[PDB]
Ligand binder design. Structure first.
Ligand SMILES: N[C@H](CCC[C@H](N)C(=O)O)C(=O)O
Ligand SMILES: N[C@H](CCC[C@H](N)C(=O)O)C(=O)O
Lengths: 120, 122
């Protein structure tokens, strides 16, 4: 008898204009991610940050990455997760998921999407 | 909800039988127990149980025996571990799907089997 369990998770964190801090409402989901990273010790996370299309290019490139790093930082510093298991990358505004022509649209683009994959 | 979480279970069970028998030999109890445990941990998982025979004896005896073997594995899960019967399918294939040489005792022993695949997510 042989068996495997595969873990697949997606975490979505949203940010306010110019901010890269993790809102308190997202703490429970980050805690769950940490829990599963312990349950599946070989799991890794691909954290990708984004920004809306407003402002200078240099600002958003740094801001998108800062947002991804904030998520990684929470896992590393608050949950004892090894940093090497978490990759971070910023895409500025090059990958929107909503329309930047609207208030709510831009709100959706200011985000960090993290994909966690593992097996045991 | 700002998060999606999925765990996929894949499990393969193998049970072998003595000639003309469909009972579960005690040596397979641990495996069956492990399957039962995962079926509880993954309440929506289902199992595909398939029974077989070696090629000796009348065709109808083997059609019935192959199915009886599959049903014996299902019965263990259902009655000893209270698994919902509807989550488990059973089917017999007589001697139609050999995995070994019917010309040897060892090969025929390998053909008298039940293979079950358990899949599902939580
Ligand atoms: N419009 C903002 C700068 C751009 C922030 C935006 N690109 C983001 O992703 O937060 C400001 O008026 O200072
Ligand atoms: N010795 C008996 C029963 C054979 C059952 C066998 N085909 C199996 O899969 O257990 C016969 O040859 O008629």
């Amino acid at each position: 008898m042989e068996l495997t369990e595969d873990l697949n998770m997606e975490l979505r964190v949203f940010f306010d204009t110019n901010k890269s801090n993790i809102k308190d409402q997202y703490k429970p989901e980050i805690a769950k991610v940490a829990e599963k990273l312990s349950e599946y010790p070989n799991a890794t996370a691909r954290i990708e940050g984004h920004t809306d299309n407003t402002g200078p290019r240099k600002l958003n490139e740094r801001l998108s990455l800062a947002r991804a790093n904030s998520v990684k930082s929470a896992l590393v510093n608050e949950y004892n997760v090894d940093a090497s298991r978490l990759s971070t990358q910023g895409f500025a505004w090059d990958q929107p998921i909503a329309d930047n022509k609207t208030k709510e649209g831009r709100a959706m683009n200011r985000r960090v999407f993290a994909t966690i994959t593992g097996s045991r």
